[PDB]
Structures are given as C-alpha cells and as structure tokens.
C-alpha cells in the first residue's frame, strides 16, 4: 500500500512566475528591433536547458543572446520566452502569424508545428 | 479575440524538475545531512527552484550557502525523497515512512506534507 501526494499541477505557473520576477538570472536576452536594442529580458539556464523548445537559448551561464524580431512581433516576445518556462501558450488569430515566425527562427519545433496546423 | 487555441506540454514538469535534482549538477547550495552530530550523507540544491516553493522555506538561502539538516538515524532513507519533493511537488508515502516523513515536514516547514501525513494515520490506525 502506497499513498501518493500530488501538488505538481501548480508547476506550469510556478516556472512561469520565475521568469516574470526577472531575478536570479544567468543569461541576458536583448531584443534588437529596427537596428536599435528595443527590449530586454533575462533567462535561467537551469530551467531553459531542461526544455528542448528553448534549444536556441542553450548557452553558457553568463552569455548574452541577441534576438532579432520584426516590429510587428515585439508584443508576442514576452509570451514566447515565458512558454519555455510554463510549457503553455494561448494563441489567437492575430498572433499565430508572429508566433510561427519566432518558433521557426528560434527552434521551437512543437510551437512551429502547432501554429502551422492553425492556418 | 473570440477564438483562442492553447498548447499545453506542462505535464512533463513534475519529473523534469525532479531530474534536475537527481543529476546533482549546476547546484548553488550545499545540503549537509548530519546524524547524531557527525555528517552522514550529502546533497546539493538549486536556489532558483527551491525559493519558488513555500515547502522548501528552510532551504531559502543565498546562492553558495551551506545548509545543515539534523535528522534521526531512522529517517536517513527518507531524506532523498523529501528533498526531491521540493522539486517534483509529488511524493509516494508508505506505512513505514509516514512516521519519518511527518518528522521531516514538521522540523523543516513543509506544512502541506505535514498535513497530508497527519491525515494518513487516521487510515493506517489499524494493522493492514
């Protein structure tokens, strides 16, 4: 007889909130838009290296990664990076075009396959 | 705005986080398990994962810190599964371990585990 306790349902948002806080980072993500560095974010190598979707972000702790995105796709970058942590993403008609561009350019094969089927 | 398509691959996360602890690589916390004074067994933690869990409140320390855990000689085999529970957020408890797992949770602020173990003996009050 073995009685199991499971509180693992929270883990999707638990990991998502680690990215939201932007504290204890060991990776710097710069978002260059129209030449100049428009936005900035940070990552946690320990969480990122565990996900095959975040293969583009599999770098040495302390490395600076430069993300070049279209001016149209600037609001969809935060959700895209959070998807590597949370492993959950909500896609609408207006964002399926931009999310497919990001997944193709940054090796998020599962997301790329999902966006392609939504057309 | 009327149609939203959601992708969810978050089911893996219980074991994904559990395997991070299993590997014992890329640690930024040293956990020394002492039994009757002298050091018996050693482990390592990841502050980023541990600080996210309220159960691991005892392990909420600066990256690089050395944490000492003073446990009973009987509760030594339950130490590895107790620390993994902070990562995986899942634990398998038996009749022989429910006594030890309640001692660990009470002494190291794992309130959810302490509450679960206490409710279990109302069921295990009998032999089998």
Residue numbers in the entry:
A (entry chain A): 129 to 247
B (entry chain B): 127 to 254
From the reporting publication:
The cellular glycoprotein LGALS3BP (galectin 3 binding protein, also known as 90K) is a secreted antiviral protein that has been identified by us and others to interfere with late steps of human immunodeficiency virus type 1 (HIV-1) biogenesis, resulting in poor infectivity of released virions. 90K is composed of a scavenger receptor cysteine rich-like domain of known structure, a BTB (broad-complex, tramtrack, and bric-à-brac)/POZ (poxvirus and zinc finger) domain, an IVR (intervening region) domain, and a C-terminal part without substantial homology to known protein domains. The resulting atomic models revealed tightly intertwined homodimers with the canonical BTB/POZ homodimer fold, consisting of both α-helices and β-sheets. As expected from the sequence alignment, the two BTB/POZ domains are structurally conserved, with a DALI score of 22.6 and root mean square deviations (RMSD) of <0.6 Å for pairwise comparisons of 119 structurally equivalent Cα atoms.
